[PDB]
Design an enzyme around this catalytic site. Sequence first.
Site, short mmCIF file in Angstrom:
data_model
loop_
_atom_site.label_atom_id
_atom_site.label_comp_id
_atom_site.label_asym_id
_atom_site.label_seq_id
_atom_site.Cartn_x
_atom_site.Cartn_y
_atom_site.Cartn_z
CG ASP A 107 -4.71 -0.21 17.34
OD1 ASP A 107 -4.56 -1.37 17.22
OD2 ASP A 107 -4.67 0.55 16.27
CB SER A 127 -3.96 -2.35 12.98
OG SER A 127 -4.85 -1.43 13.58
N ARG A 146 -6.16 -1.01 -19.49
CA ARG A 146 -7.19 -0.76 -18.43
C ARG A 146 -6.71 0.15 -17.44
CG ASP A 147 -3.96 -0.97 -14.74
OD1 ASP A 147 -5.29 -0.96 -14.08
OD2 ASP A 147 -3.50 -2.06 -14.48
NE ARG A 178 -9.70 -10.64 -11.55
CZ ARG A 178 -9.40 -9.63 -11.33
NH1 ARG A 178 -8.51 -9.06 -10.81
NH2 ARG A 178 -10.50 -8.81 -10.90
NE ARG A 203 -4.04 -7.28 -8.92
CZ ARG A 203 -5.32 -6.65 -8.81
NH1 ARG A 203 -4.74 -5.57 -8.30
NH2 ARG A 203 -6.14 -6.65 -9.15
CG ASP A 256 -4.87 -10.69 -9.80
OD1 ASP A 256 -3.67 -10.19 -10.19
OD2 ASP A 256 -6.07 -10.13 -9.72
NE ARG A 257 -6.52 -8.48 -14.15
CZ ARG A 257 -7.43 -9.03 -14.83
NH1 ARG A 257 -7.44 -10.14 -15.57
NH2 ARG A 257 -8.72 -8.74 -14.39
CG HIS A 300 -1.68 2.99 13.14
ND1 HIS A 300 -2.85 3.72 13.50
CD2 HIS A 300 -2.09 1.56 13.05
CE1 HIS A 300 -3.77 2.74 13.64
NE2 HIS A 300 -3.36 1.45 13.41
CG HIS A 305 -5.38 4.36 10.46
ND1 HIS A 305 -4.83 3.00 9.75
CD2 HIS A 305 -6.15 4.18 11.44
CE1 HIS A 305 -5.73 2.15 10.19
NE2 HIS A 305 -6.49 2.88 11.19
CL LIG Z 1 -7.85 -5.73 -12.00
MN LIG Z 2 -7.68 1.20 12.19
ZN LIG Z 3 -3.92 -0.14 14.76
#
Ligand SMILES: [Cl-]
Ligand SMILES: [Mn+2]
Ligand SMILES: [Zn+2]
Lengths: 518, 519
Positions: free
Chosen positions: A18, A67, A158-159, A195, A263, A265-266, A447, A464
């Site tokens: 790892d 991971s 918002r975005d 949401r 996405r 959730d919304r 990785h 990483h």
């Molecule tokens: Cl959001």
């Molecule tokens: Mn890690």
């Molecule tokens: Zn890892």
Amino acid sequence: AMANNSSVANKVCLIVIDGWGVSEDPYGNAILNAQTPVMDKLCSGNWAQIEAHGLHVGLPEGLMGNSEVGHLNIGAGRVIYQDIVRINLAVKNNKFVTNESLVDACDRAKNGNGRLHLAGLVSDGGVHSHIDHMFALVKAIKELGVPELYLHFYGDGRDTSPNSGVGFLEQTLEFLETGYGKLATVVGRYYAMDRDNRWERINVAYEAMIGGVGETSDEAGVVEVVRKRYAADETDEFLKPIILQGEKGRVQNDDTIIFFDYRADRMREISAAMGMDRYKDCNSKLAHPSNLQVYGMTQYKAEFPFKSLFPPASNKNVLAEWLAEQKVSQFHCAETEKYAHVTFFFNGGLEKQFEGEERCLVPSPKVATYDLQPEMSAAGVADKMIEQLEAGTHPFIMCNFAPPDMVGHTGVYEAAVKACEATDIAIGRIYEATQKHGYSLMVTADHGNAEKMKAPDGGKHTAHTCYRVPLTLSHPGFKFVDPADRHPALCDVAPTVLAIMGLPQPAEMTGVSIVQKI
Amino acid sequence: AMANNSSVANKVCLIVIDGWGVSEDPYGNAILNAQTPVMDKLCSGNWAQIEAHGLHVGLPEGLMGNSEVGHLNIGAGRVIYQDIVRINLAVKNNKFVTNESLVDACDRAKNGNGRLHLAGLVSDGGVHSHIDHMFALVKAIKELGVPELYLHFYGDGRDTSPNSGVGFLEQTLEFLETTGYGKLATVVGRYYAMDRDNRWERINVAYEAMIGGVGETSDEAGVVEVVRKRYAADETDEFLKPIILQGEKGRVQNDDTIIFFDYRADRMREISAAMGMDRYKDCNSKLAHPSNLQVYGMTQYKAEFPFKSLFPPASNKNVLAEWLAEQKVSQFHCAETEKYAHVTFFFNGGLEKQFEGEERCLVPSPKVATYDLQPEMSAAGVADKMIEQLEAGTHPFIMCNFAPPDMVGHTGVYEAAVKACEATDIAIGRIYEATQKHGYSLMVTADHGNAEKMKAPDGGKHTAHTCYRVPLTLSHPGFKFVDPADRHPALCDVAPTVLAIMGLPQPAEMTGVSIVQKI
Ligand SMILES: [Cl-]
Ligand SMILES: [Mn+2]
Ligand SMILES: [Zn+2]
Ligand SMILES: [Cl-]
Ligand SMILES: [Cl-]
Ligand SMILES: [Cl-]
Ligand SMILES: [Mn+2]
Ligand SMILES: [Zn+2]
């Protein structure tokens, strides 16, 4: 033990280090600078360096590995694509026009009343959606010959800052004259994309789409309507409904509808209001349309019946499952910090233990932070793998080694160095047992991490990396070869394992073995 | 779903906050200082504070908790002990005399040739053994009436000072003459007896001393003088070459029985495997290997050994997850990645088994270098999944873990720890609202503390767990908390209490007690 353990050509031990990446730069490189004689020997002569980041492992271009992705790809013998990458690839490569669920939805409309709807957040924010996905969809829907298409524009505030909506609206109108498709609704995400179970908010968008409850307009002037809203201090996120077209532009009986946000959730509330019983929660004076079918860009809830343009990957016949199907037993071992990775994630991202699969967990040390014991529990993982090599029961055994990633995250260079020295020692003990007991040894990583402990300014680097990872092989009868069309990657680890074992490769593994017999 | 789901009297939601302890000191206390109105309300009126460290959770006195111990004890409804604690308790409470495997060994000797051996590291080092344990074994074996007992003394020089062995030897000799019973047979350094790197030429020295008396002859009167002479020659305790007392009668002979008293396995595997299995071949000894020996260990040294153990691994039968499945009640376990093992492998008793009716849910943790960069972690997602289960109502028992307080606590960043605790409190509030809408009782606890102590006294970062108590809350007004009769309440009492609220039987293996009372 499983019935076909004897038919196996070569027993294989797979070590997944790892956070161990290949970098020839020595600055802050704890791997290069550690005494690592074992990996220095294994990573020479016949060895490969393979990709573990970005699109090679199903991640957006240039993004470092991790991971969960790393073990998933290693175990799957194929690239596991994150949802966004899958959709952007479909757009780039013109794959919407043959997408099974989009074709199903367009066939539904064509054999029915001819009416399709598109709904989602219309901006370039890229958190919930992207206008480019909506454009690609309109182009495919046109090419598939759907008679009538209407767009329901949820304004983004918002975005994509509060005053860009007029530009995305102008872009959309200009786009549509394509010459196909009609804008039917404009409403802020405050209403359509709640949401928090405030269904009185959802009801505004539901009534806009079903009943045309809102301000009447047409394509000409719609921008001026919105500008008037801006002048009154009502911004994109909060736009109250604007209605274009007439009843024909409404979501009606027997209509078909696609939400293009990826996405979930919304989208659960509006999609559930349209395609399940949550319209009851809206308390609308309008009648709920009968016989609607709803499709989503992705799966919004497993409990929903909606088809998805990009449903969850099935991930059938991962290495663990295929070995069980082949009647070959197996062993997976890790210490606590990476135990989920060699089990839940290695086996395809689900809670499943297969017939003949034995698992072993080694406790991690109880210290405040792992720089205080950089060797962690690598020695104990080694002990359990040596025990399995002496037994010889399982033709495929695998383990994870934690120190380089977990100590790497501390940013403590000298601790990372000690972590890599302890890891190399463990690898050496396993290797000596593999050679005494007739296993072929393969070492990889999920990785990199520990090869980059210092930022350019000399401060800590705790993340990483995007460097390649090793792939080793002690069996002298094979040579590493590259794939025809791409760099080798983690998706190739599992195909290669099977080749050495003398087992068949399942169709679901779209990776390739990167060894040849000699 | 499962057949008796409708028979339960109350559905329970159990939240296990990770790293949330109770401290009144505001200094560096990210929990106290964070805005936590929800937990501030749940932890008022009828609530309890329970222990999560030291002997209350099976650990040595004064030792802080951790996630594996905490989730084990919470899940088990009993104290899950550590080998060392179990043995120390047995010595304090005179339980060796009734130890099943010790009695088996003594019955073997008594029904056989009467001969029994004790072998181990003789010192107060306490890493691999303790002389107090050896004394307790001598007293118990004597009380059990074994005719002949011989001691094989491995000299310590690594867990204790290199010239202390003469004192432990003198202590032992005086001890044996206080029991009018038992004889010292061998002294040899751990360099030989306790190798763990497969240097069988070292093991063979100890093996041949024990089997054939290969070494320097001495007696009770002379051994101290022999050792002192070794010291003068720069040969210290760890490296003592064999000293042989009692001659052949003190040797490990055909049909003898042998107990190793070290509780740490790594340095006992070789000598015990040499005696009780086939590694005598690896020693290449000039001595014939004795027939019909039986070997006992203080603990299990390797699963592949046939040896009985005085203290074998806990069976851990009928943990909460197994018991619910046995009662045909379904259940739900949820966590994010960093604590997923803790709500599965460890909560269920320390093994890989998923019981019938148990549904599991893993929420991905955020992909950041360190968690102070996203202190809310994935608490909101865990809460989303619990709320989905509460609306469904399928499972009469559901539980989750909230990671932020422990994992952000380990970064030592006070403001990040505060944000972690605020996000955790918000998620708890959303769950609480769902349990009230859908007819569940809410219980909140934690597995150990952390975030209540983010700063050391010098102002530096404090990144470790603590020994503070943890909360246990209950929204059901039909119960009041009551302390146990003979001890403070602890994590072992959480699982029995859940069952009491649910109206279900309690298995005998749960030696915790419900710490609520019906009103
Ligand atoms: Cl959001
Ligand atoms: Mn890690
Ligand atoms: Zn890892
Ligand atoms: Cl698949
Ligand atoms: Cl040691
Ligand atoms: Cl038990
Ligand atoms: Mn912790
Ligand atoms: Zn914990």
